């Protein structure tokens, strides 16, 4: 059974990141892993609000864009909004119940919070460039291309949450539920967690960076400059987010936190590799949708797909996966000005 | 089954606050209840960090305090830390899975986040006034007086979470779990939610304000002035927090959100009244512990108990409960300078 204040006095410096005794006292004078304390402190130092960015020129730019360029821009913004709708809530609902050290617990809540600022900022942008935001927001849910990605990404979270509820209620073992063989295994729940974090790492480290390239390609043409300033702030946060999941995954991998996780991560490695490859392929297929009606100065299906391969290689190496693509230089080095 | 991105395109302006379709798209161009949008905007405008307050003089003050005055101060700070350890995590774990409108979802995550800043600020204070913070933080978990209050407060949250997991997995009905009669009723889950919010409202609106009086009584003597400046910031946040739960409770009460909740709230009213009375009595009994070794200029068991009765009456009226105590003027009007 899960509890919001566990009554056992435990040494929180010896707890594992996940699945230990739920955190009772929230204290910040000591850390098992100070990366999480440093990320909290940095995310707090970055605190920004969308309304401090002038987006008033972007309506004119948007109106002046050719129709296929509107399609590129607004499809990209709808996807970002989709992704951070998930990211605003899911770290809290999915990970918080499983965390057993206070610095990780507070990082996850600071992370999710910073995502709601991202979500609020996409509303600020949408409201300022179209006449009827409802059209945009409704299309996020019903768009065939977008909901393909939503269903895959949300399933990593949903499956972790469902298994968690079974574990908190039933505990480990083979259980009878209405006459069904429900086998609750902590090793399996640990696998769901590790895969979910891998999917979240691809989400922030690859999927959002593909979208940043689209946003900044407009800024390179001196268009949608209010949008670009916001995305600069979002990208600076995203670098913190993906660093956190990088450290979670690698600490789980190393056996330094939980020795059972090290062998789980090895049994999962082909699964994780494949999950990352499928995400990169999905992002490549998304560029076909973005550029279905034509391309724009500085960005097209070919260039963006090169960038998918380039960034996927970097992120996969950083979590110890093999590289799925040929090594290559950055095909859009102008993006570095914005990151 | 709970889902982090529900694929049905729903009119979020017609959803109920709780138990409807989980929020898919996070948008902020429209609200069913704009109180939650206003609270988000205000809490964001208040963003502060504990390290911008100078607490360097408080170690000297603390050292100069007589031993019973140290006991008053540090017991109060341990309780505040206890309470916001719970408040840092519990809104997210307990309420987020049940929310079906985006402005409420984002308020709850902003609320919980602001609580982690409160928790970080108590670490900042503790670290700066004692030599060994571990002694303080360990006593929060093992202190007989403190864990009485922790167990009661956390049980409202824990019971709501447990019933939620049953509801998401099993749905409504009479179910067989390992041969047990598990009756999942949404009417009963709604009752657990409404009582939990009542307990959270007493927590922020009464229990913390009793503790604010203790902190500010030192500031009135020109002692622990760094602590007092932090608690001023915390109290200004707390006024937003309790306003949110006030509106949640009253909207549930009125039947404007969910007509089934209106009749549930009426069937719960004696229970809620009693829960508030028990909390006020617990806070009165806490003053006996605070002042067990003596009192200080401006604050003693009698005065603080008067303030319990005074503030309890105000908060209970604001959520439509009858007043348990005689009407009385504010016994500590100097507290208004700090609030
Ligand atoms: Fe984001
Ligand atoms: Fe992110
Ligand atoms: Fe607080
Ligand atoms: Fe609060």
- The DSSP-derived string for B252-315 is HHHSSS-HHHHHHHHHTHHHHHHHHHHHHHHHHHHHHHHTTT--BTTB-HHHHHHHHHHHHHHH
What is the rounded distance in angstroms from the CA atom of residue A116 to the CA atom of residue A85? 8
Q: Which residue among B33, B122, B209, B289 is the active-site one?
A: B122
What is the rounded distance in angstroms from the CA atom of residue A14 to the CA atom of residue A101? 9
Half-sphere exposure of A240 (CA within 13 A, CB side): 24
Strand order in the sheet with B173-177: A180-184, A173-177, B173-177, B180-184
- Percent helix, strand and coil across chain B, each rounded to 5? 70, 5, 25
What is the rounded distance in angstroms from the CA atom of residue B81 to the CA atom of residue B90? 14
Cβ neighbours of residue A142 closer than 8 Å, sequence gap 6 or more? B9
- Across the strands, what pairs with B174? B183
Cα separations in angstroms, A336 against A303, A332, A333, B42, B189 = 15, 8, 6, 35, 51
What is the rounded distance in angstroms from the CA atom of residue B146 to the CA atom of residue B83? 10
Report which DSSP code applies to B99. B
What is the rounded distance in angstroms from the CA atom of residue B166 to the CA atom of residue A166? 9
Pick the closest to residue A325 from A288, A265, A266, A283 (CA basis). A283
Let me know: does A272 contact A321? Beta carbons within 8 Å. Answer: yes
CA of B238 to the centre of ligand 3 (A): 6
For residue B208, how far is the Cα from the chain centroid? 8
User: DSSP letters along A101-137, please?
Assistant: SHHHHHHHHHHHHHHHHHHHHHHHHHHHH-S-HHHHH
What is the rounded distance in angstroms from the CA atom of residue B39 to the CA atom of residue A50? 16
Neighbouring residues of the ion ligand 4, judged by CB less than 5 Å: B 204, 238, 241
Report which DSSP code applies to B224. S
User: DSSP letters along B34-76, please?
Assistant: HHHHHHHHHHHHT---GGGS--TTHHHHHHHS-HHHHHHHHHH
What is the rounded distance in angstroms from the CA atom of residue B310 to the CA atom of residue A8? 35
What is the rounded distance in angstroms from the CA atom of residue A108 to the CA atom of residue A318? 20
Let me know: does A107 contact A40? Beta carbons within 8 Å. Answer: yes
- Which residues of B are documented as binding site for Fe cation? 84, 115, 118, 204, 238, 241
For chain B, report the end-to-end CA distance as a whole number of angstroms.
43
CA of A27 to nearest chain B CA: how many angstroms apart? 6
Size of interface A-B (CB pairs under 8 A): 211
What is the rounded distance in angstroms from the CA atom of residue B27 to the CA atom of residue B7? 15
- Across the strands, what pairs with B90? none
How large is the C-alpha radius of gyration of chain A?
21
What is the rounded distance in angstroms from the CA atom of residue B196 to the CA atom of residue B190? 10
Q: Go through B296-313 and write b for each residue having 16 or more CB atoms within 10 A of its CB, e for each that does not.
A: beebbbebbbbbbbbbbb
Chain A residues whose beta carbon lies within 8 Å of the beta carbon of residue B36: none
Pick the closest to residue A20 from A90, A89, A100 (CA basis). A100
Please state the length of chain B. 339
Domains in chain B, please, with CATH?
34-338 (1.10.620.20)
CB contact under 8 A, B137 and A27: yes
């Amino acid at each position: 059974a899960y509890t919001t204040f566990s009554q056992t006095k435990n040494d929180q410096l010896k707890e594992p990141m996940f699945f230990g005794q739920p955190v009772n006292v929230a204290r910040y004078d000591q850390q098992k892993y100070d990366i999480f304390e440093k990320l909290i402190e940095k995310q707090l130092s970055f605190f920004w609000r969308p309304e401090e960015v002038d987006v008033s020129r972007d309506r004119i730019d948007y109106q002046a864009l050719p129709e296929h360029e509107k399609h590129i821009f607004i499809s990209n913004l709808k996807y970002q909004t989709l992704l951070d709708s998930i990211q605003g809530r899911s770290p809290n609902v999915a990970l918080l119940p499983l965390i057993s050290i206070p610095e990780l617990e507070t990082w996850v809540e600071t992370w999710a919070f910073s995502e709601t600022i991202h979500s609020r900022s996409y509303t600020h942008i949408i409201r300022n460039i179209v006449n009827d935001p409802s059209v945009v927001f409704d299309d996020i849910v019903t768009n065939e291309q977008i909901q393909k990605r939503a269903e895959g990404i949300s399933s990593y979270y949903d499956e972790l949450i469902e298994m968690t509820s079974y574990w908190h209620l039933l505990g480990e073992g083979t259980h009878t539920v209405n006459g069904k063989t429900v086998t609750v295994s902590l090793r399996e729940l640990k696998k769901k967690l590790y895969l979910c974090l891998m999917s979240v790492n691809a989400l922030e480290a690859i999927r959002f960076y593909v979208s940043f390239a689209c946003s900044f390609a407009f800024a390179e043409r001196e268009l949608m400059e209010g949008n670009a300033k916001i995305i600069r702030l979002i990208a600076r946060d995203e670098a913190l987010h993906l660093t956190g999941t990088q450290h979670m995954l690698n600490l789980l991998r190393s056996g330094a936190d939980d020795p059972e996780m090290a062998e789980i991560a090895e049994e999962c490695k082909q699964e994780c590799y494949d999950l990352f490859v499928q995400a990169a392929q999905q992002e490549k297929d998304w560029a076909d949708y973005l550029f279905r009606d034509g391309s724009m100065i500085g960005l097209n299906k070919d260039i963006l797909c090169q960038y998918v391969e380039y960034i996927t290689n970097i992120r996969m190496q950083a979590v110890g996966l093999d590289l799925p693509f040929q090594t290559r230089s950055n095909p859009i080095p102008w993006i570095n000005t914005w990151l």
